[PDB]
Amino acid sequence: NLTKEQHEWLNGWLELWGAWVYSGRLEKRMSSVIAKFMESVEPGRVMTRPMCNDDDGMLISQVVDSVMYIDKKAFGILLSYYAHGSSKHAIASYYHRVARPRKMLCRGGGRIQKPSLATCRREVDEILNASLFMIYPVLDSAFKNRKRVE
Ligand SMILES: [Cl-]
Ligand SMILES: [Cl-]
Ligand SMILES: [Cl-]
Ligand SMILES: [Cl-]
Secondary structure: OOOHHHHHHHHHHHHHHHHHHHOOOOOHHHOHHHHHHHHOOOOOOOOOOOOOOHHHHHHHHHHHHHHHOOOHHHHHHHHHHHOOOOOHHHHHHHHHHHOOOEEEEEOOEEEEEOOOHHHHHHHHHHHHHHHHHHHHHHHHHHHHHHHHHO
16 A cells, blocks of 8 residues: 555546546547546536646546556546545445355355455445556656656
8 A cells, every 4th residue: 555645646647637637638549548438428517627738637537547457447536536526435335236156265265255345435436446456656657757857
């Protein structure tokens, strides 16, 4: 996990980027995942959250896509949380509803069972923390590189 300070920093940036993405300002060509996600929402919503400028939005989008494309589930969770603004409970409840049976090595032997809501919620928290951990060095380097050259 990121430090507390790294986490506050990256979380703030991803809140601004998520509002920017949600407003529809990312070219579909920049990320098939984000484009499909934005298709899946509801048009006609008002904007209630501040966003970053377009340069920062594009940069963060490029970073996020280059890191998260490998794990479409984690990417979608990240977008639900930051772009759609869905709570962690809402995200976890969706995945609980659609969860597949799992092989669980419980005390005494294995059994087949779908995961509990608490399990799904813990996993959503873990996935968000892991995504931020993977994004952080790439975004930090991206901002630093931009300033260094420009
Ligand atoms: Cl910064
Ligand atoms: Cl909004
Ligand atoms: Cl087995
Ligand atoms: Cl469980």
